[PDB]
Amino acid sequence: HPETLVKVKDAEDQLGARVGYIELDLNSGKILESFRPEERFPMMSTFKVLLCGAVLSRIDAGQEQLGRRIHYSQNDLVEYSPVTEKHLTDGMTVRELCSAAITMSDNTAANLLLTTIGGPKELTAFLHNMGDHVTRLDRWEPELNEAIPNDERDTTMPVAMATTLRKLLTGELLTLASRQQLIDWMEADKVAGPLLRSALPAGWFIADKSGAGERGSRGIIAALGPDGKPSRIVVIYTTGSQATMDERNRQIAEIGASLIKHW
C-alpha cells in the first residue's frame, strides 16, 4: 500500500540516507511494494541466514552434519561473539553455531560456519547457482560490515534478498526438514526486539534476522503473517545515516507498523 511508501520515504528523509524496501508475497513471489529495490546495500548480519542456508544444503547433500563438532580457540574469536566466547573448551556443533549466528549476534560463529563451506567465495557461488546473481559475500567478520559508500562488496539488493529468502524458506532448494530448521532459527531471533517485532500483532508469526554494521548501516529480513503462519517477506536496509541506533530502530518499527496496518 502506498501509505507504507509514505513512511519509507519519510524514513529516508529523516535519516538523511538511502532506505531500500520490499514487501513480497511468500506464496506467489509477487512484489507488493518496493523502494530502491534494485540498489545495493550492505548485508551486515543478514547474510547469516543465507550462510546457514548454504550449510543446510550441504547437510542435505551429505557433505555436512548438524551434530558435527567444531573445535576453535581464543585466536579465532573476533568482536561480538557472546555465544562462541563461552565454548572455548569443548567447542560447538554446526547446529549450535547456526543457532548462535542467527538467533544471537555472534561473529565468530559466522566465521566458523563460513570456513565449513569454503569461505565467502563459496557462499557467493551457492547463491549464483540458485539464481541470485546479485547477492555477494566477499569478506569475513568483522570486515564485511565496513559499508564503504558505493562498495559492492558484501552487498545485496532488497529484491534479490527477498526472492532468495522466499526460495530458501519454501522452494525445493532445501529439504522440508532443513527449510523448517532455517525458519525455526529465524523465529527464535533474540536480538531484533525493537524492530518489526515491536509492531507485530498478537497471534502473528515472525521469523527474522537483523543486522547493523559501520557508517550507519542497519537492516532486517523477515517472513511474517497472521494466524501463526508467515505469508509475506519484508526486507528493509539503510546505510549512510548519522542518526542514533534508536532513531534508526524507530524508523524500521514505524515502517513495520504501517505495513501491518495496511495488510
Ligand SMILES: *C(=O)[C@H]([C@@H](C)O)[C@H]1CC(SCCNC=N)=C(C(=O)O)N1
Ligand atoms: C550482526 O549480527 C551484527 C554483527 C555481530 O556482525 C550485529 C551487531 C549489531 S548492534 C552492535 C553494533 N552496532 C552497530 N554498528 C547488530 C544489530 O542488528 O543490532 N547486528
